[PDB]
Amino acid sequence: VFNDLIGPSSQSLCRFYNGTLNSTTQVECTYNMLTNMKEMPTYSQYPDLGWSKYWHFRMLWVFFDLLMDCVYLIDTFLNYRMGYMDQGLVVREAEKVTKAYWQSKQYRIDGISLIPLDYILGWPIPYINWRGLPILRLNRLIRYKRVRNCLERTETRSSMPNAFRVVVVVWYIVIIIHWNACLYFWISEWIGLGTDAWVYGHLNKQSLPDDITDTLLRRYVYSFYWSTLILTTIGEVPSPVRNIEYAFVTLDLMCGVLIFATIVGNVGSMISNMSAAWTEFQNKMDGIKQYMELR
Amino acid sequence: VRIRKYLANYTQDPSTDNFYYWTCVVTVAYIYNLLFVIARQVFNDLIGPSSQSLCRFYNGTLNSTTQVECTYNMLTNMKEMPTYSQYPDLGWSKYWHFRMLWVFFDLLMDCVYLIDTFLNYRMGYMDQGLVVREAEKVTKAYWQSKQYRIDGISLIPLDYILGWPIPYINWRGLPILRLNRLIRYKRVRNCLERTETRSSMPNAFRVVVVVWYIVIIIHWNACLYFWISEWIGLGTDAWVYGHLNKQSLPDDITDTLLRRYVYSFYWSTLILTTIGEVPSPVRNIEYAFVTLDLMCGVLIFATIVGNVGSMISNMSAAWTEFQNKMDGIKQYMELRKVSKQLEIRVIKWFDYLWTNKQSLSDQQVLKVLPDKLQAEIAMQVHFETLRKVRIFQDCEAGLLAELVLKLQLQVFSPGDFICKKGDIGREMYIVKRGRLQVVDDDGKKVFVTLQEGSVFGELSILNIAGSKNGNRRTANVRSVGYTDLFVLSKTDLWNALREYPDARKLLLAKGREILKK
Amino acid sequence: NCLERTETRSSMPNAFRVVVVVWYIVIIIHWNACLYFWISEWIGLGTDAWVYGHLNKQSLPDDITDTLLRRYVYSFYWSTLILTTIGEVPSPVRNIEYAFVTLDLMCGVLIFATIVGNVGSMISNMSAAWTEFQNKMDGIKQYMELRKVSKQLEIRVIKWFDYLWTNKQSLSDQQVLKVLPDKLQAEIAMQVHFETLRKVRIFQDCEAGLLAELVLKLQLQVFSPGDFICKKGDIGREMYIVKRGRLQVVDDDGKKVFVTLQEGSVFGELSILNIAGSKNGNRRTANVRSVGYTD
Asked: For site (Central gate), what residue positions does UniProt give (chain A)?
């Protein structure tokens, strides 16, 4: 969604009226031209799609992508040699664990989660004029079983279990609000920024107020605030204009009602359970104090 | 004549699966009525508009302000709402295809209601645990049960007469006269109950049903808001839908039927969830409606999200009860200063107990189910261990049923001893899953390896004084890895073998054979 | 005392509980409406934009008359939006209005949290028996899924549960045997079971306190239409009385009926008696098979 994270690959061209030239020309946007603008900047692509300036950011992202795919490959090798529990004991002979690997159909879950489409079609190629699809690395999210086993085997073994439960539901909250932030800015890019007053842009006037620059940090910070106000159903955001914005805000508010109702219900139960022994002691003392009062 | 002699003695069995799929068909027809009768009453352009919108227009070529029919650029950014003038045929010359589509679906769901009335007329009531399938008894029990009034109010065809735009009477149609089809709610409630008892994904069906309840409630409040916005008059004040609302029709937004339903659905979503980011009311009847609607939204959405929070709390209830047991044991071993190796042995036992998760789930089956079905469950699960056990292959069959209802599971650690040389024998063991080893007292050298299905510990609980150990165990027994054991006690086996003397003579003779071996 | 002695004696208790908390809601919002208009009169109407008056512009908009009905209707709407903490009212201006709105919003948070908690509990309790039945069915369906029980036993168990919810007169004796005294439990056991106590051959000829002491110790077992109650070689530990259902005695393998034991018929009383003159003793004399469902 926020495709300026790898470098912008398209220079912003604001319309500008220099008084010395006495002409209204399109030049590249500085930070004073993104502050208090009358229209959104038009983007024109670089001929190399930004690779001559932002190769250090792109090789940082490529290095972390290769590091987590090597972590996925070593996890696939440990899946290939995993000792299954047969009769209460693990099996440590190689032919039995590879045969029980190939019979259990774990290799399809390990194989869909390692298709390297992201190294081919996930980066800005200038020769094809391919802008890159980073969403083709969504196949790495199919390995959720190892994460669920790590969270289960952490909170059975942890000496502070309620602190880990609170940290895990806070991480669930931040990941849900982040995915709704990228969903809001994908719809705000798809409709067109600055076209109406619900979409991010210059017409929103909560997104870009007086003396506020339009940067990538402003885009993520306003989209995170919009999803925080929508998913907690405070709703102090601009009301929708077009019908597809009404459909998205209605679906997002009902999803926010349902899943934040269950999430805060879990947080209220988890902080009710941090002093459950004191409350059960207090119910026994309330019963005995009421009995000795009435008799 | 074949369908006449078939229908002369047809009687429906309500317990069958074909009747349950018929209740799904009646649920589909009921959901059609429950949405589209109030959508057709309020949003009456769903059947064709039957009144052309006449916007006031100033053409600069004519230099005159005339009333012409509204195009989509004249409903976009308007200064006043369009006045409606009726067609002479009430739109039947243009919108007969939409009206015959609605007439065809209305006739299809009324034929579904008629076939459901015929199955009500021939429904087999349960008399003595059996259904009745003779025709005179089920029609007499139909006419005595007063089901015919509920079936008869729900089939009055007022909608085919006064529910459509008739041009000769200049009758604009009352689609709300098809609200009598909503009295058949018992078949829908039986379909939802008999679906979520029989479904293998019950919590997904519960979540889908409360999402459908949410959408039907917000849709009925959407049609209620647009009925009050039509009744007050659209565009007359800033709470009502119209041009003065400025959230309903902003800059460059056309006023269509989709805009009316989409804004009314958004208004009821913000009112019933009590976010309230809608225009504040102006007239007093709008204040009364918004106050009543907000209090109804507080109450029924509080109970609905309470149900959704309980239903997604119950999707992981076993993990939370396991975590309360682990929290109690971890708090106990923290405060009593238990050493580290017993604590890692206990949490490794709990990691094993959640990893296999086929250990201890017998409690609700032993609570609510009858003993014949509990015995049949004990046959069908445990059959691979009941087929190998040396006493269980040679007994009376009711004796092995009475013994297999009294077994229990004990999970054992890989270092744990099951018996030592000098423990008193009070339990007989059957290895359900796991590997066992007999060893020396201090030498620790194996003699035999007791595999799965092997039975031991039955002579150490027998009371024959010819065996010199008596109640003492004959050998050291150590589990190799983790071990589930079918554990038969001394007392329950001695009761069941007291009730059967001939198998007691057989096991006593096997005691003589193991004494002379 | 009138509300307590109404909802103990009412045949619709949950409807009375819902009507009483709706009356509590309306009386609380009415008293906060009169509290808001007393402070709006005391400060002075139309002096600022939080107070009722002409400067409020939600209270008196364009073409809205200031009447007594407008005063009560706007004050009731203001307290409905404050006590439910929607808060779409004008923000306060003077400091005493800030103190009143802060105190009123915190009172609204606390007492409407407990009131809607009571309403959520009261409409959760209107279908508590169906949810407890569904927890038992969820446990049994999860157990038969994980143990790989075959399909015909699973459809027999869910058909038994469909019958157990369809008649719903099977097992509801637990709270009566808990809290009620044994004289009233005995009188309930007389008044319900009288059509089966009038036919039973031991129960027509005994001492009356003996039949009371026996009828407190009975129990219900529901039987499937294929199920056998006794076979030829089971040890007799139970005496049966057919409360509702049809029974049949059959051969060992020939499966031909001899008599049809109807409702009210008593059997299984000689097989538990310890007289050695009967050659079977504890063994059952005949095969007994239920025809349909059988209590």
From this structure: 260, 264
